[PDB]
Structure formats: C-alpha cells, structure tokens
Amino acid sequence: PISPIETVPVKLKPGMDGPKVKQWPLTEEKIKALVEICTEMEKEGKISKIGPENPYNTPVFAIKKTKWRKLVDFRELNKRTQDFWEVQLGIPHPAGLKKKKSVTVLDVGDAYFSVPLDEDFRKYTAFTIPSINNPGIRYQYNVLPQGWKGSPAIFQSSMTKILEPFAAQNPDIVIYQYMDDLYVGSDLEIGQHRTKIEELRQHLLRWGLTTPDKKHQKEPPFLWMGYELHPDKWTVQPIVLPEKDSWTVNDIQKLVGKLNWASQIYPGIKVRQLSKLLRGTKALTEVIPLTEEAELELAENREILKEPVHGVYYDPSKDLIAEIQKQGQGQWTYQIYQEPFKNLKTGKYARMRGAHTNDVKQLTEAVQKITTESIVIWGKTPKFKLPIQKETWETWWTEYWQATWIPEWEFVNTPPLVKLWYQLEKEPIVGAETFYVDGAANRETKLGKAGYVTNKGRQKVVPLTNTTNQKTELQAIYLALQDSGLEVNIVTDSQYALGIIQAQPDKSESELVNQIIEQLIKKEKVYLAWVPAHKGIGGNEQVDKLVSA
Amino acid sequence: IETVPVKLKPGMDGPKVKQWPLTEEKIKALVEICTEMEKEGKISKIGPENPYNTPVFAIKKSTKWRKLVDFRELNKRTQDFWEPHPAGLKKKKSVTVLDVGDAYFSVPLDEDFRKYTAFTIPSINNETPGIRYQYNVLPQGWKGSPAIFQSSMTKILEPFKKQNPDIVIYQYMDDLYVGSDLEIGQHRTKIEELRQHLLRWGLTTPYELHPDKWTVQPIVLPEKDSWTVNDIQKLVGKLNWASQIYPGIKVRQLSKLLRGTKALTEVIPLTEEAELELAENREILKEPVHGVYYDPSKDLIAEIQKQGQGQWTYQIYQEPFKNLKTGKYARMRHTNDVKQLTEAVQKITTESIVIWGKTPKFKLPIQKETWETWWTEYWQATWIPEWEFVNTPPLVKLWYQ
Ligand SMILES: CCC(=O)n1c(=O)n(CCOc2ccccc2Oc2cccc3cc(C#N)ccc23)c2ccccc21
Ligand SMILES: [Mg+2]
Ligand SMILES: [Mg+2]
C-alpha cells in the first residue's frame, strides 16, 4: 500500500486557514462502521489518531449503497486549497491509438490511498468519528484523501515518477496512464508480453501499487469512456434516441449530445435543425415544439443508427486521408481513413458562421475543422480528397478578401460537386438596363416601400408592411432583379445591402436573401454598383425622391 | 549570480494559458531543445503544485528548430515591473536589428518568480499529460528580461557609444536597433564592430531597414482617357470618403456630370469645371493630414486589407480616421495568403517598434482557427503582438487600393 514516494508540497490559498466544518450526528450503526474502517486504515498507515490541538474538522459519513464505505465531504477544504496543474481533461481518441499485438488493462487498487500526503498539510484533513454520547475520535490523513482537490494531480504525478524507471529499461512497451488505470501495449510474444506485465506488476508492487492478476485482469471488449474497444476495431457504445410526444429544452440538449457523440463514427449524422430549436432556449424545462425539418432530421438519424458501424486503429506507416461530402443545406460530413473503406473516424460540420454563406466558404471551413482535429488526434494533417475543382476553388480564394490556407488536395468527381452557383460581374454591362434602386421604412410605424427608376424611363414602387430600412434596401434589389432582363445593372446606396450581395452567398437564414439568390442564379450577368446617398448623383436622387414622397 | 526580486501587479495571479496542440514534428523539436536546456540548468521540471502555464511554439529564424514562448499573458501580468524610446531612430538612413536574446541566459531568475514561467510541451492525442518545465534563468520574450539585464547592456555598449556618438541604439525585448546616417558599407562595418565587441564580451549574436524611406501613402485618384458613369460614381464615392479626412474636397462639379438617369456604361466627357475640381482634389490629397498626434497612453491599432495579386494595404491608428501611418506591402511570389499576411504583420510590427517603441494590436482578415493553425510556419521574429480577427470588407479595400 503506502509508497516510499516523495511527497508534493501543498499550500492553502494565501490568507486562508483550514476547514472547521462541524460533524453531524450519525446513526450508531454508521458510527460503528466508521470505527472499524478507521482502525483498519490506521492499521495500514493511511490515517492516524491525533491530539486535541488540531482545530480543523471535515465532516465524515458512511453508506453501503453489503460493503460499508467511508465518504468524506472535502468541499470546504477544497475551496481553501491551492490550484494544481489541471489533470488530464481530454481523453485519448480511439482513432489515434496505434494497433498493438497485445494490450493489457491494469486497475490500480486504492490508488489514492497508496500515495503519501505532504506532512505539513495533513493537519487540515482532520476528521472526527461521532460519539453517540455527544466522545470524539480525532483522525487525520497520511495519504491522498478521496475527493480532495489535490489527489488526482498528485497521484498522476507520482505514478509518472514511479513508472520512469521500468519505462527506461523497457522502451518498447507503450504505457498509457489515465486516472487509476494503466493500458499497456506491446508487439511481443503473448509470453514475453505477459512476463513484462508481471514485471511491471511487481515493480509497481514495490512502490505500494497493487494491480490485477491474469485471472482478474479485464478482457476485451473494453467499455471505456463511452467507447467499445475490440482488438482490431472500435466503435461507440449503444445510442438510444428517445421517443417522446413533447420535448423540453433539456431533452433536446441530451439528444444533440448523443447525436454529436454518434457522429464520430456514424457517417451522415445531422444535428443542425435540432440545435436550431435551442436558439433562445431559456429554461431547460420549457417545452420546445419540433419543426418539420427537426422531425425529418431526427428521423434520418434513426435510420443511420439502425446499422452497426466501427472504426479502425492507427498505423503510423500509412498515409492519413480525409474525404468531404455535402449532406444537404449547410450540412457537411467527412471521413478520415488510411485504408479506403476502413475509417479511422467520421464527423460533420454544419456552421454558417453568419446569416449568409456559400458552399466554397463552408467547405474551406470544414477542411479547417478537419485540420485542427487531425493535429490533435494524430499530430499531423491529412491528404484531402475533395469534390471541388481547382478552377472553382482558385477563383473563390483569389477573389476572397479574407486570407485562406488551401491544402494540397485531389479533385474527386462524386456529385454533388461544390461549385459557384453564380458570379457577379466585375465591370458594368453594356446594353443592360440600369436600375437605380432604393428602399425606405418608417422606424416607428414600421411601414415601408421599395422602388426603382431605370435609364429606359421605367419606375415602380411596391409597398411594404412590418419592415426596416435594412430589409427594404434588400427588397429594392430583389424588385430590380424581378423586373429586369437576363442582364442588369443595379445601383444602390445601401452599404448594408451591398455587403450582403458582394459576399455572394448561396444560402441564408432570411427568405428574402434566399429569394434574391434564386434570382441571381437565373440571371446571366448582374453588376452591382454603390453610390453615396444624398449626394445628388443622377438616378440615385430620383429613386430617393420617389421612395421618399 | 544574485537575483533581482520580481513582483506581479497587486491583486494579480500568474498566467494560465492553454497550450495549443502541435504536430509530432514540432513536439519532437521541443523535446530535443528542452532536454538540452535542462542539462544546461536553464529550465527544471516541475510538479503538479504549479498550476501556471504559458504556451510554447517551435519556429525557425533557419535550418534548425527554435523554441518561442508566448509570454504575452505574463507580460501583461508583470508590466508594472517592465514598463526610453528615442525619436531619432526613424530618421536614420539605415537601421539594423541584432538578436541579443542569448545574453539573458547568463542571469538567474528570482527564485520566487520562476513558477510563473511554467510551460508545457504537449503530447499527441492526450496520451500523456505533457512535459512541464519552468525557467531558472531570464527567459527570452519576457519583458522583465531586458529590464533586469539593462545595466549589463549599458555597461557593454558604453565603449561603443563613446566611439560612435551619432549612432542610435534602441533595445526592444530581445533585439537591438542600431541606426546610422552612414553609407551602407560603413554602416555594415560599424554593425560588425558592434557584433564583435558583443561577442568578445560573451554576448552571442546570430535585418537592414531604411525608415528614411517610409511615409503615410497619399490617396491616389484614377486617371482615365475616357470616363463612364460608373467611373465617375466610383470617383465621387472615393472622394466622398476622403472628405472625412481632407475637408476641402468637393464633388459638386463631378456629380453634376451625372445629372439625369444614365446608363452605367455611358461615356461622360470630363468637362472643365469638373476637371478643375478633380485637379484641386488631387492637390489637397498631396498635402498631409493635421491633428494626427501620437498618444503614448493609447493602444496602437493596425488594420490590413487583402488587395489581391500579392498586395496588402495597412493602416496604423489610435482613433478612427486619424491614421498615424498607412502603407502597402507587396510579395514577389511558393507564396500563399497566410505567408503574405504573416510577413506583413511582422513588417508592420517592426515599423511600429522603430517609430513608437511598442507593438500594435492587429485586426487580422483571416479566420481565427486558420491563423492559430498556421501562423508559426512563417513567423521569424522573437516577439508576438496582440491580434484579433475581423471581416470589414465593404469598400475599405478599393479606397486604400
Ligand atoms: C490490437 C489489439 C488490441 O487489443 N488493441 C489494440 O491494438 N488497441 C489499439 C492500441 O491501443 C493501445 C496502445 C498502447 C497501449 C494501450 C492501448 O490500448 C488503449 C489505449 C488507450 C485507452 C485504453 C483503454 C482501455 C480500457 N478500458 C483499454 C486499452 C486502451 C487497443 C485499444 C483498446 C483495447 C484493445 C486494443
Ligand atoms: Mg437609401
Ligand atoms: Mg505550455
């Protein structure tokens, strides 16, 4: 048990003293269980009886949930002890584990209780077994208490230092550490490996760390952190999408949770319409009525989850490869693999990063997400097989005002291909009618109008209810598209509307912009020009006076 | 051999910044570098009782790998301790940058402050919690290091400044800026004398600038043989923009040439009154702006626009429409947007150090994660400015073009 390991010095937060949380009375039966557990733990050196001078206390409890166990509420001591180097939050991803002929799982028993606790800090762990009479069996810890803030980081650290020696004289045995577990892999003879396991066991037993014997060592399949690890494959654990008549905010959060979890291996998971439902969200209790698109999305997810799927492990010897496919409006899906149909993992990307975007922008963002994830999981970036042609992407990233990093990729011709649905003109169009557009709205009555005046002498005003100056300026552009031929010059004074159209979106949150896009696609040539308002520039002044009167 | 006590600003704890994931290659390069630095006593491994952290990066300044520490957060949290600049440095004809950061590793760091220099070499795929170190000596990149070393630096440079009184020497973090009005060959000789002087006194040293040729680029108006309605509308819109900066600009005669409701491609003869108005507006743009004064208490801000074909415009200001400096960088293309932006940022920051002695806060036209992924691939400087990520496309591009 207790080890000859060096201790970590620990301090309380500056200006803070130890906890003095008084103890609550306990059932005579719980007082008895605590007395026999504490005498067994004092017997092992884990705790020690203390004099009456210790002014600190931490409440102690006993439950059986037979096997009575002692639980200590360290909340107050934790609030008072210094921060530590954050223990491992992220866990390894199954798709980044390197395949190994042999894998062993060691559970370290009573992990925390095997590591000593800084001497100067032990007085602050004091606890008291209650006396029915009130009397008072004061104790204090000599090892890492369970539930204390420092135990995970200090046990972690200690185990790293303990393992260093064996690792050095065994540089061919991979030893993952994670909580009170160790996962040991090797490419040796089941025999050699076993022997090396038994060595590590006895080495760890020399530092007070008990570990499991073959007859007690866990066996594959390994149910670990929501995964299923087989010798040659991995997948996620059973996902049960509930069936309910009514859905609360909380039910939807759990639902997109499980679906986000399933998307790392099940290709084609879509979650966007469902998470659209949680926009203002509010209380997790509010019933949120489902949209038809959220119903279809959920229904397509259940179809996908009907078939079992698995991922493979990593061979640092083979290339890393990523493919991306469009999965509907704004929804994308990707696979990462080394062998053409044996996926390391999958994922999705359905962010608009704005009210409006276009396919090429979203694909580039998808590639970005894949790049970041590849560096996390494998320490490198993959090769990209993408359904877009060089001319499409080169035209976009050259004309795009934002700096972009486009990897080296290979066009894979697998419809739907990513394309530019339209391209605005760069120079005014000869022979095309020139529409001077403007809109206006009353910021109080919310009423408004959109209108044009052209160079052929045509004028028009359409009325609008419940609108804003921004929306009418888009409606004026939409109106000029509606009433023009296949080639049209449009002149607006709206920096707002110009910015939206110049960005060349092909999908939007607003149906008006979606309508404008349909018109832009049906046109052959559109040129959009801008002029400062209220400067008496010809054509612009006529529509202003028109939509103003 | 004796340490200089270092403090953090009152009521402020050490840095706790996330270490960014790195490729296997950059991690391997950091382990090699840190193993050697640990053998030399410069860094020591730390235990779990140290909660602080500062990010580290593997860069190249360039065939061998170099370690770069992002002490931006620690510099903010100790600045009282490290917070003169000579106004003549921008006037000099040639200015050479010397990397003198290796001299910091001669000086031990205050033992009570070392824990704040903690950093982490990350693992791949969270296999290991990461390798932890702190600094035993003054680290490169910490603003406290040139401040503690300052007396030794004055002492070593005193003979050389005695010999060369007209030569300006400014230090900013790990670099020395050395300005002269001499001819280029005499300048590089004076630079080499200063190198050898530093080298024979135990300061190891591995950039020629010419601020005498910098300027706030004047607004430029098009010159065309034939103007369309569209060209006049662009012209009027750009002049209308500049009139927020230059008050005397008028567009009445130019916009009069468009009266009516005209086809955008219709050719408009540039009449006399309009041509005079345009000629007058070209003259007022040649003269500079007024009231644009630098304030040392306010943060410098840099905006940058992609112009295409390798060109990038930038403006440095502290208050909107009060540019202290404007500029246009070009790239003689193996190039890409990120390479050109990374380079422009370093050029702008160097220009800003020379002129005002501090780094500006950048508004970068790039997606955050793309910048965070690739910025080290072309970063050669030893400092790192603040930055944020923006869009602002509208017409800013064509007006500064
Ligand atoms: C190939 C045979 C086999 O059973 N497994 C296998 O190859 N992998 C992939 C490589 O994974 C490891 C490499 C070195 C150390 C341990 C490895 O296994 C694990 C890594 C990380 C976490 C683990 C958690 C558990 C649990 N519970 C078990 C093993 C882990 C395998 C991965 C898992 C299980 C079997 C194999
Ligand atoms: Mg208007
Ligand atoms: Mg770090």
Q: How far apart are CA A448 and CA A446, in angstroms?
A: 7
Sheet arrangement for strand A487-492: A459-464, A448-454, A433-441, A487-492, A525-530
Look at strands B131-135 and B267-268 and give their pairing: unpaired
Other beta carbons less than 10 A from residue A293's beta carbon:
16
- Assess whether the C-beta atom of A220 lies below 6 angstroms from ligand 1: yes
Mutation site, B28, B53, B121, B127, interface A, largest A CB count within 10 A: B127
- Measured over the CA atoms of residue A270, residue A272, residue A277 and residue A282, the dihedral's sign is positive
Other beta carbons less than 10 A from residue B369's beta carbon:
14
Look at strands A383-386 and A321-326 and give their pairing: parallel
| b/e code A368-385 from CB counts within 10 Å (16+ = b) | bbbbbbbbbbbbebbebe
Residue nearest to ligand 1 atom 8, measured at CA: A99
Instruction: Choose which CATH entry (3.90.700.10, 3.10.10.10, 1.10.10.10, 3.40.50.300) describes domain B5-87+113-153.
Output: 3.10.10.10
CA of A246 to the centre of ligand 1 (A): 41
Q: Kindly provide the residue ranges of all beta strands, DSSP E only, lying in A485-530, ordered along the sequence.
A: 487-492, 507-508, 525-530
Q: How far apart are CA A401 and CA A272, in angstroms?
A: 28
Residue nearest to ligand 1 atom 4, measured at CA: A231
Element (H, E) at B144: helix B144-163
CA of A494 to the centre of ligand 2 (A): 6
User: Taking the domains of chain B in order of start, what are their residue ranges?
Assistant: 5-87+113-153, 88-112+154-208, 209-294, 295-400
Q: How far apart are CA B249 and CA B282, in angstroms?
A: 9
What secondary structure does DSSP assign to A206-271, as a single string? HTT-----GGGS--SSEEETTEEE-SS-EEEPPP-----SS-BHHHHHHHHHHHHHHTTTSTT---
Resolution of the experimentally solved model in angstroms: 2.2
Using CB atoms, pick whichever of A83, A97, A368 lies closest to residue B51: A83
Q: Which CATH class is domain A28-88+111-152?
A: alpha beta
Instruction: Choose which CATH entry (3.40.50.300, 3.90.180.10, 3.30.70.270, 1.10.10.10) describes domain B88-112+154-208.
Output: 3.30.70.270
CB-count burial class (<10 Å; 0-12, 13-18, 19+) for A366 = buried
Listed residue (B25, B374, B398) closest to A371, CA to CA: B374
**In the structure encoding, which two tokens stand for residue A136, read together?**
């008072």
**Max Cα distance, chain B (Å):** 83
- Measured over the CA atoms of residue A373, residue A377, residue A382 and residue A387, the dihedral's sign is negative
Instruction: Choose which CATH entry (3.40.50.1980, 3.30.420.10, 3.40.605.10, 3.90.480.10) describes domain A433-548.
Output: 3.30.420.10
Element (H, E) at A337: strand A332-339
Give CA separation, A93 vs A102, A218, A283, A377, B362, in Å.
19, 20, 33, 7, 35
**Residue A364 in 3-state DSSP?**
helix
- Assess whether the C-beta atom of A92 lies below 6 angstroms from ligand 1: yes
Query: Residues A99, A84: contact at Cβ < 8 Å?
Result: no
Phi, psi of A44 (to 5 degrees): -85, 0
User: Looking at beta carbons, which residues of chain A come within 8 Å of B125?
Assistant: 92-93, 96-97, 376-379
Other beta carbons less than 10 A from residue B61's beta carbon:
13
Q: What is the CATH topology of the domain spanning B295-400?
A: Alpha-Beta Plaits (3.30.70)
Q: What is the CATH number of domain A235-304?
A: 3.30.70.270
**Residue B222 in 3-state DSSP?**
coil
Q: What is the CATH number of domain B209-294?
A: 3.30.70.270
CA of A308 to the centre of ligand 3 (A): 40
Assigned architecture for domain A321-411: 2-Layer Sandwich (3.30)
| Residue keyed to tokens 């110049």 | A502
Residue nearest to ligand 1 atom 35, measured at CA: A231
Give CA separation, A68 vs A27, B37, B158, in Å.
13, 52, 77
Q: Kindly provide the residue ranges of all beta strands, DSSP E only, lying in B28-167, ordered along the sequence.
A: 43-45, 56-59, 66-69, 94-99, 119-121, 131-135
Q: Is B337 annotated as a binding residue?
A: no
Q: How far apart are CA A242 and CA A302, in angstroms?
A: 10
**In the structure encoding, which two tokens stand for residue A488, read together?**
């049209």
Shortest distance between the Cα of A379 and any Cα of chain B, in A, equals 4
Q: Would you tell me the crossing angle of helices B229-242 and B272-286 to the nearest 10 degrees?
A: 40
Other beta carbons less than 10 A from residue A93's beta carbon:
20
User: Looking at beta carbons, which residues of chain B come within 8 Å of A97?
Assistant: 125
Q: What is the CATH topology of the domain spanning A94-110+155-220?
A: Alpha-Beta Plaits (3.30.70)
Using CB atoms, pick whichever of B51, B233, B395 lies closest to residue A537: B233
Query: Residues B143, B9: contact at Cβ < 8 Å?
Result: no
Q: How far apart are CA A542 and CA A548, in angstroms?
A: 10
- Assess whether the C-beta atom of A222 lies below 6 angstroms from ligand 1: yes
Where does CATH 3.30.70.270 sit in chain A?
A: 94-110+155-220, 235-304, 321-411
Listed residue (A483, A466, A476, A469) closest to A543, CA to CA: A476
Q: Cα dihedral angle (B368, B372, B377, B382), rounded to 10 degrees?
A: 110
| b/e code A303-330 from CB counts within 10 Å (16+ = b) | ebbeeeeebbbbeeeeebbbbbbbbbeb
- Assess whether the C-beta atom of A105 lies below 6 angstroms from ligand 1: yes
Query: Residues A166, A199: contact at Cβ < 8 Å?
Result: yes
Residue nearest to ligand 1 atom 15, measured at CA: A185
Distance of CA A420 to the CA centre of its chain: 30
Using CB atoms, pick whichever of B46, B260, B264 lies closest to residue A491: B264
Fold agreement between B5-87+113-153 and B88-112+154-208: no
Look at strands B361-364 and B387-389 and give their pairing: parallel
- Experimental determination approach used: X-ray
CB within 8 Å: B369 and A177: no
User: Looking at beta carbons, which residues of chain A come within 8 Å of B251?
Assistant: 535
